[PDB]
Amino acid sequence: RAGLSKLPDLKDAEAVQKFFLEEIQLGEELLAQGDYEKGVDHLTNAIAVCGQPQQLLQVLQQTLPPPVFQMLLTKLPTISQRIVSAQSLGEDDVE
Amino acid sequence: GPRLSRLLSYA
């Protein structure tokens, strides 16, 4: 038939599905070790080949409660965290 | 288990 590898040409949907899933799983498995940081990157890559992040996010939120996902969301923005860590010096009270 | 391919059976 033919060979098999990651990101062959992308014209084929089946190859993209195979790799996309290989990454979805590989990530969960690395996190099963504890490499959350790699899960964020690998998941970001899964989105890079899917192009429909939001669909996948709904699919990830319903298949299992994802704590890593929350860290993916914290890895993305940097400036935002700085505002919070100043505006109200991280956290403040109310009366 | 370390196999997120549960939902992915849908496609």
Which residues form the domain of A72? 1-95
DSSP codes of every residue in A65-87? --HHHHHHHHHS-SHHHHHHHHH
Q: Which of residues 1-11 of B touch A (CB under 8 A)?
A: 2-8, 11
Q: Decide if A69 contacts A57 (C-beta within 8 A).
A: yes
CB atoms B8 and A29 under 8 Å: no
What CATH number is given to the structural domain containing A15?
1.20.960.10
Q: Decide if A69 contacts A60 (C-beta within 8 A).
A: yes
Method: NMR
Let me know the angle formed at the C-alpha of B8 by A59 and A51, rounded to the nearest 5 degrees.
65
Optimal mutation site among A58, A59, A64, A68, interface B, most CBs of chain B within 10 A: A59
Report which DSSP code applies to B7: G
Return the SS3 of A89.
Answer: coil
- Structurally, chain A folds into a number of domains equal to 1
